Amino acid sequence: NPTLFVSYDQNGKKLSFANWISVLSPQDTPFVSMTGKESINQTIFSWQT
Amino acid sequence: NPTLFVSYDQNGKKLSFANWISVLSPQDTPFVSMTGKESINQTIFSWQT
């Protein structure tokens, strides 16, 4: 094999990959977290004022 | 036309109203929350100073 053995002449070398993923995702949701839930039956709802 | 049932084609529909009414007309009236009232008989009253 080549005279001088260096990192560029290596085959079958492990990847040294990282076992995680940078999940940089904001999901605060301040509004929906305090609005409130109310079930309905139709696709159109109305109210009086 | 389509034998399947779709919201746009439904005829008998329960409106699913809100079951209340919203009114914001203020009713504070602080000046009426003063000292109590005083019943009288005649349409003209008076006092000495």
Side-chain angles (χ1 to χ4, degrees), chain B residues 22-43:
Chain B
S22 71
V23 46
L24 304 169
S25 298
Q27 309 171 34
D28 45 4
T29 70
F31 200 65
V32 179
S33 312
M34 65 164 54
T35 39
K37 288 134 171 164
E38 176 60 16
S39 174
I40 54 174
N41 301 330
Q42 293 291 328
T43 60

Side-chain angles (χ1 to χ4, degrees), chain A residues 5-25:
Chain A
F5 207 73
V6 287
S7 60
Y8 308 83
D9 298 325
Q10 284 169 331
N11 278 328
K13 46 174 165 179
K14 304 180 186 170
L15 295 141
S16 184
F17 215 97
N19 64 332
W20 48 254
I21 311 180
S22 186
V23 172
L24 189 122
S25 166

Side-chain angles (χ1 to χ4, degrees), chain B:
Chain B
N1 154 46
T3 64
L4 182 60
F5 317 144
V6 184
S7 53
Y8 305 100
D9 302 324
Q10 299 204 237
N11 264 73
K13 284 144 59 172
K14 332 195 96 179
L15 306 180
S16 74
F17 252 58
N19 204 100
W20 49 252
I21 308 174
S22 71
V23 46
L24 304 169
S25 298
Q27 309 171 34
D28 45 4
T29 70
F31 200 65
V32 179
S33 312
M34 65 164 54
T35 39
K37 288 134 171 164
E38 176 60 16
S39 174
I40 54 174
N41 301 330
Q42 293 291 328
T43 60
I44 299 159
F45 50 91
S46 278
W47 58 97
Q48 296 179 77
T49 90

